[PDB]
Amino acid sequence: LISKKRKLVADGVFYAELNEFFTRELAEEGYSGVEVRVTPTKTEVIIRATRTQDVLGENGRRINELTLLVQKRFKYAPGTIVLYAERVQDRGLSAVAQAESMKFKLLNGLAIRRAAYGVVRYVMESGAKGCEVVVSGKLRAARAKAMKFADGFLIHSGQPVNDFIDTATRHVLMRQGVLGIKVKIMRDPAKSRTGPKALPDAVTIIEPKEEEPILAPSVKDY
Amino acid sequence: IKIRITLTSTKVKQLENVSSNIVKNAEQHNLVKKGPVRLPTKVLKISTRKTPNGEGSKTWETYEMRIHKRYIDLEAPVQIVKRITQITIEPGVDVEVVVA
Amino acid sequence: MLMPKEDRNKIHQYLFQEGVVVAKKDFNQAKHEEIDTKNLYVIKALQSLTSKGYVKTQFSWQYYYYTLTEEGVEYLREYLNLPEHIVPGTYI
Amino acid sequence: RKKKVYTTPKKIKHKHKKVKLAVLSYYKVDAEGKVTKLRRECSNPTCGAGVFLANHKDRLYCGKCHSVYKVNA
RNA sequence: GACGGAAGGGCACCACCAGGAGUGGAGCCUGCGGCUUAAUUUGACUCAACACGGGGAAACUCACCAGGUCCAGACACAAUAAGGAUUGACAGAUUGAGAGCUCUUUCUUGAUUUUGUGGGUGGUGGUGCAUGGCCGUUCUUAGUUGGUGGAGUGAUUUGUCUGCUUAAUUGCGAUAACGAACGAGACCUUAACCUACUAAAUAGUGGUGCUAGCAUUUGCUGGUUAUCCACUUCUUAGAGGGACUAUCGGUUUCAAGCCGAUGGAAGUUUGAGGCAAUAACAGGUCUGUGAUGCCCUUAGACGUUCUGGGCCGCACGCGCGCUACACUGACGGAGCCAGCGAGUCUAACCUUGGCCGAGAGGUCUUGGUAAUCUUGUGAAACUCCGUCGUGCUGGGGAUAGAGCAUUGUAAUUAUUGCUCUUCAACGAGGAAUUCCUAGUAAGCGCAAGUCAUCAGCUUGCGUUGAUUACGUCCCUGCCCUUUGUACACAC
């Protein structure tokens, strides 16, 4: 009905609305992203989470409630908007889930240094190429301080930082204020399967195959 | 009948593979068809100040969203028309059906 | 503040019909979606229900998505005396 | 947040909420007989024919007709 | 480490032999500082505020100002109590009305309601010197950091460096260092050259479906789809081609590099952008938040019904800018050239008209869910015939009074546009101060942003186009090394 340019802008906006809804409601279960599928007379939203059984509930009661919420937001024909929640593997290789676990650990009350070190160890052993946790705020003092815990090695400039680097910025409400966690995870270029296969500067040399000389006059008679 | 499929997506890779599989299946099915007419790419620009408040140098940024629109005009029986329309459906790419 | 019995029953019966409501942050609209009553009426009544302890709210760009609870539905179910396994509020 | 004098005197004179007076609704006092009516309603159907409407002085005000009711009684 | 009116080397038109364009000279659209009853809201104080808070506002925005004036004990604790708790309501007393703000008196949706707590809500209230995020700036310059080995009791050094180049800790290289990480590059877009792999009634050629001017001479200009043939070698496209200093000279412990000439797109990484170094501002932002912490108010509160006033009072000073000192100009007539830019669905967006006017506006939709419609956006100093013609003139609508109107339920203290007038500054414009390496300076114009209505602003594009730049630190700043220091909130 609406012109296509405004319709796609509204599609992106609605993506952002439901993404905020899922990030704000689906935090405790480690929400880490969505995938919206487009098809004539049917829209599908894939919710990649970790605690997917504890999202689905009994016979998908909660996910059915969520897709009904979206359906009533859009006033679309019931059943057109469908939701499916899947257990995304390697929950450690996701900035959103790692920052959410940081938030939960901090609110639980574990010391910030040990928390950051635990998350960075988990991220490192989970196969991540590089990790960086920046915690900003009041840390055992009344003046703001920032602690940066890094491992591996990341990048900051170019397109590779745009694509490989997954970033999550979370504002944890603590007792004396708000702390800020910036989790920056560099992933593997050869673990994308989309776009560039490797870093634009890191070259891989091809394996040669040696061939023996002739050493003698032979004639292939046929 | 003169049906027409037009697609108005934003992701060029999905756009191109949709077009490629459509034209390749049409060619392997040995029909009569018109080539994919490829309208100019429309770039939506939004120019805004980087700063939330008014302090600092007067620096600006431009966020661009690229829109790719292609279309194909066909004439065929209804059954195979619906078959071609409904197969090879991909998320992110929006397609619609028109006449003449 | 005054809460009309007719509109309260309308909102409760819509909550039992569907299971959840969206309350767009538009006060004085006086023409709610899917309910005849006023938007401020819906929003305040749902906040009253939450404070009573029968439903939870999510804001998500000031839209007021609602979601009922176990005791929240069972209290109203025994209030209206509707029998068990007859009418879940938000059944599949 | 310190410039407030309240020059005008105490203006909190909220109108009363129908204080509980003596037994209201003195319809009539007829033992073993028909209880009559006073200042009866007109031929308008929407009147309840048993509802005690307001009759202050040479005018009638209808409870049902809350907004639009202007008649010469 | 910082600094030095210390030394060496290398850089930068946020710096300069040179030159161009402005400001402070005139007026005016704008933003800042002090008096004003109650208000002329608040933030920002060098570069790194001053056409910035996308802040071009008459409601709202807008919390500032004078005013009537309501609820939230949301949720749970002690109360009368259906012989009842409660909203709202008319010509009749000041508020402008069917704003019961208080009435000489009532009607009355019907358990929804009033006194102190525990925990709260709202706040464009304060704290940005509690903060998160973000952004600007040191410095957008070439610069930061481990591991393992060397040095030193140690702080800490080497690595990260004598020499040689553009922008480069860029490299060649010597070497107590070897091997790495981040920045630079590398990367992703933008404009350029493609007679190719694949193109549509949106950019055409000949016959034609119909017709005219130069004539029976072979063509151009015209005007249209289904009636077709050959192509995107001009608009745009998608596995995509080249440019890497290719080649030829000159110069070197005869090593990286520099300086000159060819089809071809240029041989200053092709030109320009995007995110951008475990370091820091106690720089801005608590006026972008249902982000809170600490205090303010806790039922006449900063939450909010309506009326208005206000960055439109100035005695005044300072800034991006616009129009000008005119005969390289002003005006009158004939030509009259870009696209990335925008566009009604729960009720309108830019405009194609039979009628009227240099003006806005009506009857139907040719425009729609959009390369086909607005729009070749036929938009400006640009090419020719004259008038004004050096005399403060025809450049000033500064300034002020008369009439038509799109918008807004109010354009009155010209919102804005079009018909009419006075003449107050202007003889290379003082101290000072800002930008400019190939189509950039500058001139002139167009589109989006803010919008219920108007650009003098900003972000992008288009037309003509630049002498002194392949130089230097003399001024302002940098980077490295050496050096001195009584500095270390660091001159």
From Swiss-Prot, chain A:
The keyword Plastid does not apply. The modification Omega-N-methylarginine is found at R143. GO terms for cellular component: 90S preribosome; cytoplasm; cytosol; cytosolic small ribosomal subunit; nucleus; preribosome, small subunit precursor. The modification Phosphoserine is found at S94, S126, S218. Its main location: cytoplasm. Keywords: Cytoplasm, Isopeptide bond, Methylation, Phosphoprotein, Ribonucleoprotein, Ribosomal protein, RNA-binding, Ubl conjugation. GO terms for biological process: cytoplasmic translation; maintenance of translational fidelity; nonfunctional rRNA decay; ribosomal small subunit export from nucleus; ribosomal subunit export from nucleus. There is a cross-link at K103, K129, K138, K148, K197, K209 (Glycyl lysine isopeptide (Lys-Gly) (interchain with G-Cter in ubiquitin)). GO terms for molecular function: DNA-(apurinic or apyrimidinic site) endonuclease activity; RNA binding; structural constituent of ribosome. Gene3D superfamilies: 3.30.300.20, Ribosomal protein S3, C-terminal domain. Signal peptide: none annotated. Ubiquitinated at Lys-209 in response to stalled ribosomes. Ubiquitination leads to activation of the No-Go Decay (NGD) pathway and degradation of non-functional 18S rRNA: first monoubiquitinated at Lys-209 by MAG2, followed by formation of 'Lys-63'-linked polyubiquitin chains on monoubiquitin by HEL2 and RSP5. The modification Phosphothreonine is found at T41, T67. It is found in: Cytoplasm. Residues 18-89 form the KH type-2 domain. Belongs to the universal ribosomal protein uS3 family. PANTHER family: 30S/40S RIBOSOMAL PROTEIN S3 (PTHR11760), SMALL RIBOSOMAL SUBUNIT PROTEIN US3 (PTHR11760:SF32). Present with 146000 molecules/cell in log phase SD medium. This is Small ribosomal subunit protein uS3. The gene is RPS3.
Swiss-Prot record, chain B:
The keyword Cytoplasm applies. It comes from the Eukaryota. It is found in: Cytoplasm. One of its GO terms (biological process) is maturation of SSU-rRNA from tricistronic rRNA transcript (SSU-rRNA, 5.8S rRNA, LSU-rRNA). GO terms for cellular component: cytoplasm; cytosol; cytosolic small ribosomal subunit. N-terminally acetylated by acetyltransferase NatA. Also partially acetylated by NatC. One of its GO terms (molecular function) is structural constituent of ribosome. Its main location: cytoplasm. There is a cross-link at K2, K13, K82 (Glycyl lysine isopeptide (Lys-Gly) (interchain with G-Cter in ubiquitin)). Keywords: Acetylation, Cytoplasm, Isopeptide bond, Ribonucleoprotein, Ribosomal protein, Ubl conjugation. The keyword NADP does not apply. Component of the ribosome, a large ribonucleoprotein complex responsible for the synthesis of proteins in the cell. The small ribosomal subunit (SSU) binds messenger RNAs (mRNAs) and translates the encoded message by selecting cognate aminoacyl-transfer RNA (tRNA) molecules. The large subunit (LSU) contains the ribosomal catalytic site termed the peptidyl transferase center (PTC), which catalyzes the formation of peptide bonds, thereby polymerizing the amino acids delivered by tRNAs into a polypeptide chain. Belongs to the universal ribosomal protein uS10 family. This is Small ribosomal subunit protein uS10. It comes from Saccharomyces cerevisiae (strain ATCC 204508 / S288c).
UniProtKB/Swiss-Prot annotation, chain C:
Belongs to the eukaryotic ribosomal protein eS10 family. Keywords: Cytoplasm, Ribonucleoprotein, Ribosomal protein. It is found in: Cytoplasm. This is Small ribosomal subunit protein eS10A. The keyword Magnesium does not apply. Component of the small ribosomal subunit (SSU). Mature yeast ribosomes consist of a small (40S) and a large (60S) subunit. The 40S small subunit contains 1 molecule of ribosomal RNA (18S rRNA) and 33 different proteins (encoded by 57 genes). The large 60S subunit contains 3 rRNA molecules (25S, 5.8S and 5S rRNA) and 46 different proteins (encoded by 81 genes). eS10 interacts with GCN1 (via middle region); this interaction is direct and promotes GCN2 kinase activity. Transmembrane segments: none annotated. Component of the ribosome, a large ribonucleoprotein complex responsible for the synthesis of proteins in the cell. The small ribosomal subunit (SSU) binds messenger RNAs (mRNAs) and translates the encoded message by selecting cognate aminoacyl-transfer RNA (tRNA) molecules. The large subunit (LSU) contains the ribosomal catalytic site termed the peptidyl transferase center (PTC), which catalyzes the formation of peptide bonds, thereby polymerizing the amino acids delivered by tRNAs into a polypeptide chain. GO terms for cellular component: cytosol; cytosolic small ribosomal subunit. SUPFAM superfamilies: Winged helix' DNA-binding domain. The N-terminus is not modified.
Curated annotation (Swiss-Prot), chain D:
It is found in: Cytoplasm. It comes from the Eukaryota. The modification Phosphoserine is found at S43. Disulfide bonds: none annotated. There is a cross-link at K28, K34 (Glycyl lysine isopeptide (Lys-Gly) (interchain with G-Cter in ubiquitin)). A zinc finger (C4-type) spans 42-65. Component of the small ribosomal subunit (SSU). Mature yeast ribosomes consist of a small (40S) and a large (60S) subunit. The 40S small subunit contains 1 molecule of ribosomal RNA (18S rRNA) and 33 different proteins (encoded by 57 genes). The large 60S subunit contains 3 rRNA molecules (25S, 5.8S and 5S rRNA) and 46 different proteins (encoded by 81 genes). Component of the ribosome, a large ribonucleoprotein complex responsible for the synthesis of proteins in the cell. The small ribosomal subunit (SSU) binds messenger RNAs (mRNAs) and translates the encoded message by selecting cognate aminoacyl-transfer RNA (tRNA) molecules. The large subunit (LSU) contains the ribosomal catalytic site termed the peptidyl transferase center (PTC), which catalyzes the formation of peptide bonds, thereby polymerizing the amino acids delivered by tRNAs into a polypeptide chain. This is Small ribosomal subunit protein eS31. It comes from Saccharomyces cerevisiae (strain ATCC 204508 / S288c) (Baker's yeast). The chain holds residues 80 to 152 of 152 of the full protein.
